[PDB]
Amino acid sequence: VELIYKVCHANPSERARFIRCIYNLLQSSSPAVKYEAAGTLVTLSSAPTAIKAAAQCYIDLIIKESDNNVKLIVLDRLVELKEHPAHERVLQDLVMDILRVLSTPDLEVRKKTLQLALDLV
């Protein structure tokens, strides 16, 4: 017997069902910002660069939902980390620069990152 009216009431078991129940009550344009899904998810690619590369992808997606032309593919939500105020301190773009890569982190993360610079902006 699953689905609660509450937030919880306690314990890992209730907690595990709860992220399933949350995804129901907001399906809309992926989870966007991953819920209690995040904990199992890292181990799913323990070998080792692939986790960061994946993580980088989600973080880029999350920033904004742009036009979505050829390699401008960022989904998730339109505003939830914006892009580009001129009063924002120390700005969004600092994280965007990582994604522009020569190899600036390692090659698996690099391939993901170049696509990801292209994708947000």
Add this chain to the structure above:
Amino acid sequence: MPLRLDIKRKLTARSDRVKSVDLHPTEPWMLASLYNGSVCVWNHETQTLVKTFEVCDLPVRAAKFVARKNWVVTGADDMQIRVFNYNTLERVHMFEAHSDYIRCIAVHPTQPFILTSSDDMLIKLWDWDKKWSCSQVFEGHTHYVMQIVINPKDNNQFASASLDRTIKVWQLGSSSPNFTLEGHEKGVNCIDYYSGGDKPYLISGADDRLVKIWDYQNKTCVQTLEGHAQNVSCASFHPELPIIITGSEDGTVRIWHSSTYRLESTLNYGMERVWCVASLRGSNNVALGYDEGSIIVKLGREEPAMSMDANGKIIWAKHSEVQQANLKAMGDTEIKDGERLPLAVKDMGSCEIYPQTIQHNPNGRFVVVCGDGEYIIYTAMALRNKSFGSAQEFAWAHDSSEYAIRESNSIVKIFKNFKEKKSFKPDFGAESIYGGFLLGVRSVNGLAFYDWENTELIRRIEIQPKHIFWSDSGELVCIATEESFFILKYLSEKVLAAQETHEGVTEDGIEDAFEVLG
């Protein structure tokens, strides 16, 4: 002498005598090497034990992480340093580091090297990349090499402490110690450097009850630290804070201010015989090895004290173009919001006390330096002594010519024009204070708001706060709470009838005078 501290027990673990304690070079984990023949590591932030390794069945004196390889080096009474992968859980390599058990290991992240110090009176070098071949052997020490540390200004240099009453500074290139320091008089248990790019320092600890500070640049002994009232097992330098943390076999740890060597604290735990110390290089965690276990402890000062007025005097203490003892700072710069703005400091006159908290007035007429149960008021931009007062805590309110203080008599105090207000004195007790117009005082699992009119209990909110700040109209308040945040309405008229009537209970209040807006 005063210093921002707050000793906190981050994680404890009970085990047979832990000779070495370490923080993981780049990870939030701390590794302790035990006499269980096991080394164990725990990440003392989430309170999860990440992994254990059974190095030997006889004590492991030393353990450290070579973070880049994702490996841990241990040296045990196998007279071996055995290497393991701390995520693929298996023994990476096994090698004989020495002819005797390995007291300490030091890791050079920039080079493939570990040098290990052993009580075969020799320190040997091993290169992890060669599969733990013996790169270099250092012959210099004629006694039991208790500890090794790498100098952070030249990693090619390390110092080793041996119970031979010297700490010898060696270079990798040279088997022999390229110079000797005679750092102690009853053998040197430990050597440490005071970390940084501009700090040439050594420390020696000895069983003459004493820790000694040495300057390696000048070669003189800067001062002698009382250490402990029994043989100093180890001594180390904290990087950020000006203190030395020492441990002794009397089960006591003492903290000494490194500016006059007057006792900052004495800590015992019911674990006793404190063998080692080590400090995190990124600062504010020190870990100490004891007979009955290990502890990882978290030191205070996490955040700076400063305040921005309307005169562009943004005042801090410490920092650049400002001294800690005196007071200064200005910030008149408006360069782009996207980066950190320059210091932009302009000089500011006299001070007489230490800044526990140092703050400008919110509209610029006063400066307050608070410190040692006293507040001293200095004038906004002239810094002549305006006023004085008592304050274990000082907070400007909204009024900022009325302020709240904790005078620590069990009543939260208001001082107005820096002169005490006794028309303000809670019918709660006190345990702590929140500023703003209705002073929040926390007592008996309550937050009580008091009037600056007759000090009656207006209301009590049943979730205690982090803060109360009141708007500059004093009808609206913003409450920082573990709840998250409240905005409350103080209905002024309702308060005037209630307060006069004193219908508001001594410790529970009247639930009408205040109302919960959101």
